[PDB]
Amino acid sequence: KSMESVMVKYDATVRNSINQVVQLRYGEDGLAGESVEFQNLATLKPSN
Amino acid sequence: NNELEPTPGNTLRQTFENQVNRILNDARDKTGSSAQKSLSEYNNFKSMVVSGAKGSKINISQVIAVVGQQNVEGKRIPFGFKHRTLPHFIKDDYGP
Amino acid sequence: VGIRFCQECNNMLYPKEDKENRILLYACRNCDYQQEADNSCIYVNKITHEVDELTQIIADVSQDPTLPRTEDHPCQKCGHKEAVFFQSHSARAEDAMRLYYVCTAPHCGHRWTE
Amino acid sequence: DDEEETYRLWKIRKTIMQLCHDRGYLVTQDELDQTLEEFKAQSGDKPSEGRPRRTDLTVLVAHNDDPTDQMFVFFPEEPKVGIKTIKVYCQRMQEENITRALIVVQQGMTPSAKQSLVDMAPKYILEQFLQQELLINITEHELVPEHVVMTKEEVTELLARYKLRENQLPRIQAGDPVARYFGIKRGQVVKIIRPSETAGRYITYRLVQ
Amino acid sequence: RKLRRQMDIIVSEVSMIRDIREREIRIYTDAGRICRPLLIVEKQKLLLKKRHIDQLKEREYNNYSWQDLVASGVVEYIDTLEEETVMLAMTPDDLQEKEVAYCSTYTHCEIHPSMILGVCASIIPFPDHNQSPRNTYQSAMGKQAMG
Amino acid sequence: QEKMATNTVYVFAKKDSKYAYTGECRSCLSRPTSTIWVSMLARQRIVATLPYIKQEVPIIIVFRALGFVSDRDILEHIIYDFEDPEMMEMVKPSLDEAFVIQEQNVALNFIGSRGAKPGVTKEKRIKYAKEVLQKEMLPHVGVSDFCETKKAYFLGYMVHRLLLAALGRRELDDRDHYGNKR
Amino acid sequence: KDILCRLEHTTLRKVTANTAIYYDPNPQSTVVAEDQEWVNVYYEMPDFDVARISPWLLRVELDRKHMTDRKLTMEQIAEKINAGFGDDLNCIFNDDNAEKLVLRIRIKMDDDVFLRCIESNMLTDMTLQGIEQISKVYMHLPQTDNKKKIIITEDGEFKALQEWILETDGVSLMRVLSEKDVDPVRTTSNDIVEIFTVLGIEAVRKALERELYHVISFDGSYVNYRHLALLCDTMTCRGHLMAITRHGVNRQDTGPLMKCSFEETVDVLMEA
Amino acid sequence: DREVLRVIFPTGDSKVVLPCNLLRMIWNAQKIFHINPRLPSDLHPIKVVEGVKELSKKLVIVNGDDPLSRQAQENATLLFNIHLRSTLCSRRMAEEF
Ligand SMILES: [Zn+2]
Ligand SMILES: [Zn+2]
């Protein structure tokens, strides 16, 4: 009931029913949560 | 004989219960590991657990070795009677 | 220490100070009757409760058939082998597992702790 | 006694210097970075019946754009501040023709003096700061992301780019501790830059209401 | 206790409890109290003997029954809060005999440990080899079994 | 139908309630159930919630209304051993709270003032409280006016059990103990 | 351990063995046996036995175990009592040599009644050490990398260090952040409203996100970040903590038909 | 990019959720085109850098030519671009893939 109206608009912005901006891009990256997978950066951990 | 030293931050009852629970959990885990090691390659319990279809290593341990400690509200079985669990046991009996 | 009662009316004594004289006395307000006090303490408060329970526990618990009993610890005065043991009941102490012992014989009311 | 009060005063002064630097006021590197021993030597160690009385501590700093716009920071002598004391500060403020100032209250302020503060708002703006709030810089906490006060031109560009009316933005209330730290007005828009574990970085815009 | 066991002027309905530490003695003739029969143990020996079993095995055409067993002082009714003062032995042949003794002051003995189950749970074969939730499911489903 | 047992004193402890300990005795002579409560207030003093009476009443006022003027007799019914100072220290504030009432008729008027109404006259006010204390207070102990002494003992036992609960000398009664049920 | 003792709330009751009120009319002719041996030291050149001094004596005993566990000083206790109450009590106290650790206190309300009230105030409220609303403080070395300090070495590697951390029962975040040698950057609490009132709204956003992630992933399950982020953003969008209840959701400026379908059906339409 | 990652990810947790699985994709390419790791490669190292640079322009989350839009696009695709550059390193391409 609290979230029922939150929705991705055609601006790719996330707005509620009053058009108030909740997120400027969905998920802060604009990607759907079903096509993503786990991966390794491979640059973070190594020694210099 | 009041020889048990209370762990910092924890009451004497808390550390006594912790030690007994530690001992019993170690026993149950050792017995379960032994039972799992004793399983043959033809055992259907192992064939079901290894493939992950249904059941688990604790299920095998309880079936073969030891059902284990029984807990009420995350604690060992309380004293519903005055100072004992059932009328068959003696008062002030903290044994397993 | 604790309550004392007036003789004239069986009511509480409570303390008053002899203003002209600097001696404490007990005076029951329901009458004139007075007592210069023996108790130079009027109020004491055992905040830490370090007290052992030997006075609260009593010899008749020796007759409880559901209590455990061992021959290991002998009584001091008679040395009868049988002695029933049980745990503390004080809610509020630095310890919670010490055993209170009572001599089991019908004619030796004697008690100890370990 | 006296050493602890000195330590508290040194922390408060350092936090106030960081405050002024973050607000865009000309603060020299030495004033930003002052060792405890240096502050102790400058202001004379023990405060109680000693050289750092509270009135010894007041700060005048100049803005980078214009040196005419100057901030005083006051450190009241009294555990609680009254209308009389605030009127004395305002009289001095008018005599020095300055427009902005802070007050560092040791315990708290009477509501009548708070109302006196807001009554002055179109003329002279005074901001209350409790002593404990200035004992640590909340901006350096790990939970607080980067805050940047936007100019009116930047706000206009933002609203033209996203075609947003001002009320459609996320909001931040004026009583927010970060909004108190940056001295942010009703109607201004803040820019928050925080790291994200999906994108890497994310910018949020809050309207101050 | 002697009068209750002799049924003389105290009905076996009546429960008597002595709380030694609190120095109280409570007697209940009240209705609604749940109770169960138990065998009396005197010293380390049951009061139930081979002659009682012989007479009960010849129960037919002997007018000797459970009421005659009660009147002999062999079995006793005990309710919930009298059990607090009762030392129960799970079985006679395995807790009355001398060992490195757990207890020697046993006062009562269960008839059979399987008497703790209800009507629907008494049809379960090997109920001690199962998980308790499954026993509950069977107890619930037995009321729906057709016959 | 399962229900709590009657005529037996129980002691419990509520979390948020103004009382640290609440002793009660659901009493039945075969009739609707006349529950007295005897409670100990938190930050300590003892008050009673009598049936058909508006508000709490101090214990000493009730005891004096029962006909026991003297503090010795009241504490002798409450405390069975005068050699224990902790019990005296626990009871003392309750005595001090009800000092302003010293006469039995004054106590009866005090109780009647908190009745279902104050009666029309001093005699009807005092009469209503006497009827409530003889008919509605502890009916299983007795109903004939001689039994007030026995009623006093039972009330003293209730208070004594509450004091025992307050001293930690006894364990609080378990409500799900199936022997406490009928 | 020093920080632990400085952080934990300790009342005078915890270190007090027992208390007794005596009648001790004259300074020198005391009721007690040992106090003659310091009463003489105090009254042979009497400190302020200049006005009259009251017949009623208050006498608190202090357990040595608790006294030395918390690194207390009887001089510290006397200073704190005298400062908290002013000059309206005279404090007489022993050197640590005395085996029986005594703090002899002397003063409309009657003398003993006021002195009993003093005792009942001191035991409960004296607040000897630490920060109140802090019941207990636990100290331990974390085994989990999320509580272990992880730093970058000179080779650019990630090295995990073990340092002592404290976990309190009860929350007062501001004064703990004020405390000497407490790390202000990383010190955090699990309370959301306390973080609000201390650090602001973005801090609540992040802390609420962390709490939700912890409570969801403690079971071992995994939930995508986007849903947690959306929940936190919706709760913190309007600038204050919008609880997901009838109050927080129906105080949004939405249509009355949306509100009547959640938890306040008739009242919403009546007000609209 | 390594410094940025070390700022973004303390504790050094390298597991990240990203759209397309580059290692699996490279392995797919290796198997589709029958690539022999035992033989020298014909891939010019300039083309690796140029292809990465041109691909990074075609992954648009925020569409626009304003500086604000450019900054938004960079913040949106920073992590994925860093990962893409790390995996499509010219040396890593020449040695492993
Ligand atoms: Zn008298
Ligand atoms: Zn003996």
Asked if residue G248 lies in contact with residue G236, where contact means CB atoms within 8 angstroms, the answer is: no
DSSP F177: -
| Cα angle G58-G64-G65, degrees, rounded to a multiple of 5 | 135
Q: What CATH number does the domain containing F31 carry?
A: 3.90.1110.10
Q: Which of D206, A23, H72, D148 is nearest to G201 (CA)?
A: D206
Q: Which of F161, F167, F139 is nearest to F11 (CA)?
A: F161
C-alpha neighbours within 13 Å on the C-beta side of residue G200: 27
Q: Which CATH code fits D1-136?
A: 3.40.1340.10
* Residue ranges with strand state E in chain E: 15-19, 24-28, 35-42, 45-46, 75-79, 88-89, 108-109
Asked if residue F6 lies in contact with residue F27, where contact means CB atoms within 8 angstroms, the answer is: yes
Angle formed by the axes of helices F71-78 and F85-97, to 10°? 130
CA E101 to chain centre: 23
Q: What CATH number does the domain containing G25 carry?
A: 3.30.1360.140
**Which helix (H) or strand (E) is C34 found in, with range?**
strand C34-36
Burial class (CB in 10 A: 0-12, 13-18, 19+), G177: buried
DSSP C66: T
Angle formed by the axes of helices D111-119 and D83-95, to 10°? 30
Q: How far apart are CA B57 and CA B35, in angstroms?
A: 9
Determine contact: H15 vs chain A, CB below 8 A: yes
Report the sign of the C-alpha dihedral through residues F53, F55, F59, F62, in that order.
Answer: negative
Burial class (CB in 10 A: 0-12, 13-18, 19+), C55: exposed
Q: Which of E97, E102, E98, E76 is nearest to E16 (CA)?
A: E76
Determine contact: H19 vs chain G, CB below 8 A: no
Q: How many CB atoms lie within 10 A of CB H82?
A: 20
Which residue in the block uniquely carries the two structure tokens 């100032």? D101
Q: How far is CA G117 from CA A31, E107, F83, F90, G15, in A?
A: 68, 55, 26, 16, 19
Residue G178 identity (one-letter amino acid): S
Long-range contacts of F92-101 (CB under 8 A, 24+ apart): F92/C3, F93/F44, F93/F45, F94/F45, F94/F46, F94/F58, F94/F59, F94/F60, F95/C12, F95/F60, F95/F71, F97/F45, F97/F58, F97/F60, F98/F58, F98/F59, F98/F60, F98/F61, F98/F64, F101/F60, F101/F61, F101/F64
Question: What is the CA(D139)–ligand 1 centre distance, in A?
Answer: 72
Q: How far apart are CA D103 and CA D114, in angstroms?
A: 11
Q: What is the residue extent of each domain of chain D?
A: 1-136, 137-209
Is residue F127, in this structure, part of any structural domain at all?
A: yes
DSSP C111: E
Q: Which of E48, E50, E31 is nearest to E40 (CA)?
A: E48
Q: What is the residue extent of each domain of chain C?
A: 1-45, 46-114
Q: Which of residues 66-95 of E touch F (CB under 8 A)?
A: 79-84
Q: How far apart are CA G172 and CA G197, in angstroms?
A: 11
CA E139 to chain centre: 23
Q: How far apart are CA G244 and CA G266, in angstroms?
A: 20
Which of the ligands is closest to the CA of residue C109?
2
Q: How far apart are CA H70 and CA H64, in angstroms?
A: 7
* Residue ranges with strand state E in chain D: 59-62, 70-74, 80-81, 100-105, 108-109, 125-130, 146-149, 171-172, 189-195, 201-208
Q: How far apart are CA E69 and CA E46, in angstroms?
A: 13
**Three-class HEC string of F135-167:** HCCCCCCCCCHHHHHHHHHHHHHHHHHHHHHHH
The DSSP bridge pattern shows strands E75-79 and E35-42 to be antiparallel
Round the CA-based radius of gyration of chain E to a whole number and report it. 18
Read off the tokens for H14: 């390298």
DSSP E85: G
| Residues lying with their CB under 5 A of ligand 1, a single-atom ion | C 6, 8-9, 11, 28, 30-31, 33
Partners of A23 in the β-ladder: A14
Which residues of chain B are within 8 Å of residue F171 when distances are taken between CB atoms? 82
Q: How far is CA H36 from CA E62, G243, H46, in A?
A: 102, 60, 21
Asked if B2 lies within 8 A of C114 by C-beta distance, the reply is yes
Residue D137 identity (one-letter amino acid): N
Q: Could you list the residue range(s) of the whole structural domain that residue G87 is in?
A: 1-125
Read off the tokens for D154: 């930047």
**Three-class HEC string of chain H:** CHHHHHHHCHHHCCEEEECCCHHHHHHHHHHHCCCCCCCCCCCCHHHHHHHHHHHHHCCCCCCCCCHHHHHHHHHHHHHHHHHHHHHCCHHHHHHCC
Asked if residue C100 lies in contact with residue C70, where contact means CB atoms within 8 angstroms, the answer is: no
Helix runs in E33-117, H state only: 50-57, 66-71, 92-95
Q: Which of D129, D128, D166 is nearest to D150 (CA)?
A: D166
Q: Chain C residue closest to B13 (CA)?
A: C96
Burial class (CB in 10 A: 0-12, 13-18, 19+), E109: buried
Read off the tokens for D48: 């109680």
Asked if C2 lies within 8 A of F71 by C-beta distance, the reply is no
CATH topology of domain C46-114: N-terminal domain of TfIIb (2.20.25)
C·F CB contacts under 8 A: 30
Asked if residue D74 lies in contact with residue D54, where contact means CB atoms within 8 angstroms, the answer is: no
Residue H11 sits at φ, ψ, to 5 deg, of 65, -5
DSSP E122: G
Long-range contacts of C24-33 (CB under 8 A, 24+ apart): C24/G23, C24/G25, C24/G55, C30/C6, C30/F102, C31/C6, C33/C6, C33/C7, C33/C8, C33/C9
Read off the tokens for D91: 């009289």
Contacts of E141 (CB under 8 A, 6+ apart): none
Asked if residue E65 lies in contact with residue E59, where contact means CB atoms within 8 angstroms, the answer is: yes
Read off the tokens for G205: 């956003």
Residues B1-16, buried b or exposed e (16+ Cβ, 10 A)? eeeeeeeeeeebeebb
Q: Which of B90, B4, B84 is nearest to C98 (CA)?
A: B4
CA F155 to chain centre: 5
Residue G103 sits at φ, ψ, to 5 deg, of -130, 95
Round the CA-based radius of gyration of chain C to a whole number and report it. 22
Asked if residue B68 lies in contact with residue B28, where contact means CB atoms within 8 angstroms, the answer is: yes
Q: How far is CA G160 from CA E48, G153, H8, in A?
A: 73, 10, 17
Which residue in the block uniquely carries the two structure tokens 């070395």? G141
Contacts of B13 (CB under 8 A, 6+ apart): C96, C97
DSSP F171: P
Question: What is the CA(C108)–ligand 2 centre distance, in A?
Answer: 5
Helix (H, G, I), strand (E, B) or coil at E41: strand
Touching subunits of E (3+ CB pairs, under 8 Å) are B, C, F
Contacts of G40 (CB under 8 A, 6+ apart): G28
Q: How many CB atoms lie within 10 A of CB H81?
A: 17
What dihedral angle (degrees, nearest 10) is formed by the CA atoms of F49, F55, F61, F65? -80
Is residue F5, in this structure, part of any structural domain at all?
A: no
Q: Which of E74, E77, E73, E106 is nearest to E89 (CA)?
A: E106
Contacts of E128 (CB under 8 A, 6+ apart): none
**Which helix (H) or strand (E) is G111 found in, with range?**
helix G111-125
E144 known member of a binding site? yes
Angle formed by the axes of helices F71-78 and F148-167, to 10°? 60
Assign residue B86 a region (left: φ > 0; alpha: ψ between -120 and 50; beta: otherwise): beta
Residues A5-26, buried b or exposed e (16+ Cβ, 10 A)? ebeeeeeebbbbeeebbbbbbb
Question: What resolution in Å is listed for this PDB structure?
Answer: 3.6
Asked if C10 lies within 8 A of F169 by C-beta distance, the reply is no
By Cβ distance, the residue of B12, B84, B87 closest to C97 is B12
Q: How far apart are CA E52 and CA G80, in angstroms?
A: 82
Asked if residue C45 lies in contact with residue C89, where contact means CB atoms within 8 angstroms, the answer is: no
Determine contact: F180 vs chain E, CB below 8 A: yes
Q: How far apart are CA G212 and CA D100, in angstroms?
A: 42
Q: Which of D133, D21, D16 is nearest to G200 (CA)?
A: D133
Residue E36 identity (one-letter amino acid): R
Question: What is the CA(C34)–ligand 1 centre distance, in A?
Answer: 8
Round the CA-based radius of gyration of chain B to a whole number and report it. 18
Touching subunits of B (3+ CB pairs, under 8 Å) are C, E, F
Report the sign of the C-alpha dihedral through residues B36, B42, B43, B44, in that order.
Answer: positive
Q: Which of residues 47-106 of C touch B (CB under 8 A)?
A: 66-68, 86-87, 95-98
Residues D83-104, buried b or exposed e (16+ Cβ, 10 A)? eebbeebbeebeeeebebbbbb
The DSSP bridge pattern shows strands D70-74 and D100-105 to be parallel
Read off the tokens for D117: 């503060």
Read off the tokens for H42: 């014909």
Read off the tokens for D53: 């009385």
Assign residue B68 a region (left: φ > 0; alpha: ψ between -120 and 50; beta: otherwise): left
Residues B21-33, buried b or exposed e (16+ Cβ, 10 A)? eeeeeeebeeebe
Burial class (CB in 10 A: 0-12, 13-18, 19+), F81: exposed
Q: How far apart are CA D137 and CA D11, in angstroms?
A: 9
Residue G110 sits at φ, ψ, to 5 deg, of -65, 150
Helix (H, G, I), strand (E, B) or coil at C100: strand
Q: How many CB atoms lie within 10 A of CB C24?
A: 22
**Which helix (H) or strand (E) is G75 found in, with range?**
helix G74-85
Q: How far apart are CA F86 and CA F166, in angstroms?
A: 11
Residue G119 identity (one-letter amino acid): E
Round the CA-based radius of gyration of chain D to a whole number and report it. 19
Which of the ligands is closest to the CA of residue C59?
2
Read off the tokens for E41: 């143990």
Contacts of D60 (CB under 8 A, 6+ apart): D70, D71, D72, D98
Read off the tokens for D73: 């920071």
Burial class (CB in 10 A: 0-12, 13-18, 19+), C71: exposed
Q: How far is CA A42 from CA A27, H23, H79, H80, in A?
A: 24, 11, 13, 13
**Which helix (H) or strand (E) is C16 found in, with range?**
strand C14-17
Long-range contacts of D150-158 (CB under 8 A, 24+ apart): D150/D188, D150/D189, D150/D190, D150/D191, D150/D205, D154/D189, D154/D191, D155/D188, D155/D189, D157/H66, D157/H68, D158/D189, D158/D205, D158/H68
Q: Which of D202, G209, D162, G258 is nearest to A9 (CA)?
A: D162
Read off the tokens for C15: 């303390």
Total domains, chain F? 1
Determine contact: F179 vs chain B, CB below 8 A: no
Touching subunits of D (3+ CB pairs, under 8 Å) are A, G, H
Asked if A28 lies within 8 A of D169 by C-beta distance, the reply is no
The DSSP bridge pattern shows strands D108-109 and D80-81 to be parallel
Q: How far apart are CA H32 and CA H17, in angstroms?
A: 26
Is residue F56, in this structure, part of any structural domain at all?
A: yes
Q: How many CB atoms lie within 10 A of CB C21?
A: 10
Determine contact: F103 vs chain C, CB below 8 A: no
How many Å lie between the alpha carbon of C79 and the closest alpha carbon of chain F? 30
Contacts of H5 (CB under 8 A, 6+ apart): A41, A43, A44, H82
Which residues of chain F are within 8 Å of residue C92 when distances are taken between CB atoms? 168
Determine contact: F75 vs chain C, CB below 8 A: yes
Q: Which CATH code fits D137-209?
A: 3.90.940.20
Q: Which of residues 156-175 of F touch E (CB under 8 A)?
A: 170
Asked if residue H1 lies in contact with residue D201, where contact means CB atoms within 8 angstroms, the answer is: no
Burial class (CB in 10 A: 0-12, 13-18, 19+), G166: middle
The DSSP bridge pattern shows strands C69-70 and C83-87 to be antiparallel
Long-range contacts of E25-30 (CB under 8 A, 24+ apart): E28/E79, E30/F5, E30/F6, E30/F7, E30/F182
Asked if residue F151 lies in contact with residue F157, where contact means CB atoms within 8 angstroms, the answer is: no
Which residue in the block uniquely carries the two structure tokens 């000693």? D50
Asked if residue C50 lies in contact with residue C95, where contact means CB atoms within 8 angstroms, the answer is: no
Residue E130 sits at φ, ψ, to 5 deg, of -115, 170
